Design a protein around this ligand. Structure first.
Ligand SMILES: OC[C@H]1O[C@@H](O[C@H]2[C@@H](OC[C@H]3O[C@@H](O[C@H]4[C@H](O)[C@@H](O)[C@H](O)O[C@@H]4CO)[C@H](O)[C@@H](O)[C@@H]3O[C@@H]3O[C@H](CO[C@H]4OC[C@@H](O)[C@H](O)[C@H]4O)[C@@H](O[C@@H]4O[C@H](CO[C@H]5OC[C@@H](O)[C@H](O)[C@H]5O)[C@@H](O[C@@H]5O[C@H](CO)[C@@H](O[C@@H]6O[C@H](CO[C@H]7OC[C@@H](O)[C@H](O)[C@H]7O)[C@@H](O)[C@H](O)[C@H]6O)[C@H](O)[C@H]5O)[C@H](O)[C@H]4O)[C@H](O)[C@H]3O)OC[C@@H](O)[C@@H]2O)[C@H](O)[C@@H](O)[C@H]1O
Ligand SMILES: OC[C@H]1O[C@@H](O[C@H]2[C@@H](OC[C@H]3O[C@@H](O[C@H]4[C@H](O)[C@@H](O)[C@H](O)O[C@@H]4CO)[C@H](O)[C@@H](O)[C@@H]3O[C@@H]3O[C@H](CO[C@H]4OC[C@@H](O)[C@H](O)[C@H]4O)[C@@H](O[C@@H]4O[C@H](CO[C@H]5OC[C@@H](O)[C@H](O)[C@H]5O)[C@@H](O)[C@H](O)[C@H]4O)[C@H](O)[C@H]3O)OC[C@@H](O)[C@@H]2O)[C@H](O)[C@@H](O)[C@H]1O
Ligand SMILES: [Cl-]
Ligand SMILES: [Cl-]
Ligand SMILES: [Mg+2]
Ligand SMILES: [Mg+2]
Ligand SMILES: [Mg+2]
Length: 747
């Protein structure tokens, strides 16, 4: 079809806002670093700008599972080469994975499908690395796989893969045997070469492999991977997260009683000397002083007996990093107790690059804010600079450039080192037509942000209410200072927290109303979708659990809406405050009494998501009324199973819709400022049009469409959120599931 080149940039959050399970340093080129994520692809570091660049944005709609990066290897012989094991789930949520290969540090990729699933967003994703390159003969790669698939090898630089049938343990541990998520074998855990057992051009003969099997977890080959044997004398009862070999011949291994990233309530650290055969338990803590696994393992390349480990997960008051300079014989903690509850610290956190990491709470010794971290499954020391470490948490990448201050009685300065990283899952987006913000987001895990300059990190976490995930946000079109968001309050932690927040100042400050939807038996857990009347004189809340409710009393009371099914999608008219719209299971609904009463209209052909194995309350539906035009509604969504997929337009308040004949599939719709000389708002859609999957803009009410993204800027399964900017022609805001929010303008 037609295309128009655009400039695609990230909306900056400073910290990224998702879990980084692996950071991978190249072993021969200084400052060559990669980072991998569970749902958001991978990144490469740029030392000149102290920032990361995504190497995954070519991943698109059909091949979306490539953004689950379960393992990554960087070539020490030719550092232009990099490989990834990708695929997101190993259960019924996903299809088979693949090994991706690049000869230009991730600028471009080729791919080899694997005949099994890869688990970038499965349990144990911070154990590793499970994809490795022979450091003496770099056409050889090994991959340790999930689900009983065992050990795989390539001898042609990643093009072709075959099972290593002589590997004798495919794993035994299963995290969630009774669930539909993680009921498969975790499988193999990490692979570590002994480079001293090969020479350039000749296969490395000694290879170590960790396996998620508490009874027998560490394996070695000494004949180049022909024969594999469990290490005699190894400890039992735990799961090794990492195995790293020092030049002393000591193999260091961290263990947890889980594979993580969220669990681990007991742990050990061991070393095994490859020459003497001695095993030594060097666990930093033990007995009642240990209630957590050990996860991250970092050896110092310059000082062979210096190493660090992190807890996984202590959870309270914070995690601990432990440092040893004598091979684990003695350890120093990065913080200690004083007179309880006081603590002393060998570190200081600096979150000036992402000040919202304090979650809006006041720091105390027992409730530190910001924390050192959590989910610290990967901890790394720069092999070319003992003063630099990096580690991943569930929210960011932290690092230091004065690490060895620890050894001289000083404090380690830890700062956000995630510039360029955006990992959030975007549940909703609004671009208010007035005020200092053009973009307020609804995000998983870190709630969402009010953005002003899209290159500057937000200064504030969303509080009062404070929650992990905002499912939905809307604003009053005629009074955009009034806006409402809904999420799910953690009432175990804060029983007075509500799952709805209201703002009268454009989203800068929020308050919680005096009541929430409830029935005779329970109050809503929240989530669902929210719509705000044109004038702000009412709120409609389609809750996740107990149906649709309206309030005309600013949330002082809520009343169940008549006629609209529980789980319905909802939308307010942007002109007429009495008018709302609903949709469920193929039927369209209208209310003309402010959300109190809904009546069906006649609209046909919408995906029912209710025939031939489909479920209505999990449909892909984007439905919005148009700013400035009463009764004008666009609807995108559907699927191929029903042959009900595309983009529909109503101008009579939902009484009838025209299905656009020139849009084969569509999943999202949004609006922005009209083009010069046009009166109708520009349309932005995520769609398949003229045979091309992408992001498209129409300046003529859908008569013609131009693709405004391209094959290098696809962002995987972009069925999350989209809007134009009512104040900036051409501007699009695109939500993603693991790449944060993008904004883009014509070239
Ligand atoms: O706890 C294990 C172990 O503890 C042993 O005791 C030792 C231990 O004691 C701790 C307790 O100390 C008490 O003080 C004592 C002291 O112990 C004693 O020595 C001294 O002498 O005397 C003192 C005074 O009595 C203290 O009073 C207790 O409070 C303390 O207990 C800890 O309390 C922590 C804080 O709790 C408060 O806030 C949270 C509320 O829930 C509580 O009600 C509040 O009280 C609590 O920390 C939180 O832990 C959770 C995780 O908990 C879970 O795992 C650990 C289990 O212990 C726990 O039962 C279980 O519930 C953290 O939650 C996580 O938060 C992260 C970050 O936000 C989330 O990550 C994000 O996830 C998303 C994905 O999310 C989805 O998928 C995951 C799912 O979980 C989620 O819902 C989904 O949405 C991802 O995408 C993102 O990337 C990622 O960032 C994550 O989801 C979420 O789960 C939470 O943050 C913490 O605040 C502690 O758990 C609790 O233990 O330590 C001291 C030692 O001396 C003791 O010996 C026991 O002996 C043993 O039996 C055993 O219990
Ligand atoms: O039994 C499930 C169990 O899951 C626990 O949560 C764990 C689980 O979370 C999955 C979600 O991960 C997010 O990523 C996290 C990431 O894990 C972190 O590392 C990072 O820091 O933060 C990220 C953001 O928070 C993703 O953003 C989510 O998308 C993902 O949700 C699951 O997504 C899959 C895939 O579908 C999506 O991706 C492809 C695209 O094609 C699709 O359109 C997208 O929606 C869904 O698969 C579908 O499942 C339905 C049936 O779903 C029902 O059963 C499972 C429930 O989870 C659902 O709520 C329920 O509706 C099926 O019919 C379809 O065919 C499938 O396509 C899943 O449904 C989504 O759940 O894994 C990562 C781990 O980190 C989390 O701890 C959770 O704590 C438990 O309560 C429990 O729910
Ligand atoms: Cl004190
Ligand atoms: Cl303004
Ligand atoms: Mg680019
Ligand atoms: Mg690592
Ligand atoms: Mg602060």
């Amino acid at each position: 079809g037609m295309s128009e080149p655009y400039t695609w940039k990230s909306v900056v959050t400073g910290a990224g806002g998702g879990f980084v399970p692996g950071i991978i340093f190249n072993q021969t080129e200084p400052n060559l670093i990669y980072a991998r994520t569970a749902i958001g692809g991978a990144y490469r570091w740029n030392q000149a700008t102290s920032s990361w660049v995504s190497i995954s944005d070519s991943v698109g709609w059909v091949d979306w599972n490539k953004n689950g990066v379960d393992a990554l290897a960087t070539d020490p012989i030719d550092p232009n080469k990099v490989y990834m094991a990708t695929g997101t789930y190993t259960n019924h949520w996903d299809n088979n994975g693949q090994i991706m290969r690049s000869n230009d540090r991730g600028n471009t990729w080729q791919t080899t499908p694997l005949p099994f699933k890869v688990g970038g967003n499965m349990p144990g994703r911070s154990a590793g690395e499970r994809l490795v390159i022979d450091p003496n003969k770099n056409n050889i790669l090994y991959f340790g796989a999930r689900s009983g698939n065992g050990l795989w090898k390539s001898i042609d630089s990643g093009v072709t893969w075959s099972k290593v049938t002589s590997f004798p343990n495919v794993g035994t541990y299963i995290q969630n045997p009774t669930l539909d998520y993680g009921n498969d074998l975790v499988g193999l855990s990490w692979i570590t070469f002994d480079k001293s057992t090969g020479t350039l051009g000749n296969a490395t003969q000694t290879i170590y492999v960790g396996v998620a099997d508490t009874a027998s977890s560490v394996y070695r080959s000494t004949d180049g991977g022909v024969t594999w044997t469990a290490l005699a004398g190894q400890p039992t009862g735990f799961l090794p997260h990492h195995g790293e070999l020092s030049s002393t011949g000591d193999l260091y291994i961290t263990y947890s009683n889980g594979v993580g990233p969220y669990d681990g309530s007991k742990g050990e650290v061991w070393k095994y000397n490859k020459t003497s055969g001695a095993w030594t338990n060097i666990s930093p803590t033990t007995g009642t002083d240990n209630w957590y696994g050990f996860g991250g393992l970092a050896l110092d390349a310059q000082h062979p007996n210096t190493l660090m480990v992190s807890s996984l997960n202590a959870w309270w008051p914070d995690e601990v990093i432990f440092r040893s300079t004598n091979g684990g014989a003695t350890w120093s903690r990065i913080w200690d107790w004083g007179n309880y509850p006081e603590r002393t610290y060998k570190f200081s956190m600096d979150i000036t690059a992402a000040p919202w990491l304090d979650h809006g709470t006041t720091s105390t010794s027992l409730d530190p804010s910001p924390k050192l971290g959590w989910m610290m499954g990967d901890l790394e020391i720069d092999p070319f600079n003992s003063n630099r470490m990096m580690y991943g948490t569930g929210a960011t990448i932290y690092g230091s450039n004065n690490l060895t201050s620890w050894d001289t009685g000083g404090k380690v300065n830890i700062s956000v080192m995630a510039k360029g990283v955006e990992e959030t899952a975007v549940l909703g987006l609004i671009s208010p037509p007035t005020g200092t913000s053009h973009l307020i987001t609804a995000l998983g895990d870190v709630s969402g942000f009010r953005h002003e300059d899209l290159s500057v990190a937000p200064t504030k976490f969303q509080t009062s209410p404070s929650w992990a995930t905002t499912m939905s946000i809307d604003y009053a079109e005629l009074s955009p200072s009034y806006m409402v968001r809904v999420g799910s309050a953690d009432k175990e932690k804060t029983p007075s927290m509500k799952s709805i927040g209201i703002s009268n100042d454009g989203g800068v400050n929020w308050y919680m109303p005096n009541s929430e939807p409830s029935n005779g038996t329970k109050t809503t857990v929240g989530h669902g979708q929210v719509a705000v009347s044109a004038s702000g004189n009412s709120i409609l809340w389609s809750t996740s659990d107990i149906g649709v409710y309206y309030s005309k009393t600013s949330g002082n009371s809520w009343t169940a809406s008549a006629g609209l099914p529980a789980g319905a999608k909802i939308a307010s008219d942007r002109v007429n405050p009495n008018k709302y719209y609903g949709f469920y299971a193929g039927t369209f609904y209208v209310s003309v009494d402010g959300g109190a009463t809904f009546t069906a209209t006649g609209a046909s052909g919408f995906p029912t998501n209710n025939v031939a194995g489909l479920q209505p309350n999990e449909a892909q539906i984007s439905m919005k009324a148009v700013p400035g035009i009463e009764g004008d509604i666009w609807f995108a969504g559907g699927n191929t199973v029903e042959n009900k997929y595309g983009l529909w337009h109503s101008t009579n308040s939902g009484a009838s819709f025209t299905k656009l004949t020139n849009v084969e599939e569509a999943d999202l719709i949004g609006y922005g400022k009209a083009a010069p000389g046009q009166t109708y708002m520009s349309l932005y859609t995520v769609a398949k049009i003229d045979g091309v999957r992408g992001v498209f803009r129409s300046d003529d009410v859908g008569a013609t469409w131009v693709r405004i993204n391209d094959d290098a800027h696809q962002y995987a399964k972009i069925n999350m959120a989209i809007t134009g900017d009512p104040r900036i022609y051409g501007r699009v805001y695109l939500g993603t599931n693991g790449r944060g929010t993008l904004y883009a303008d014509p070239v």
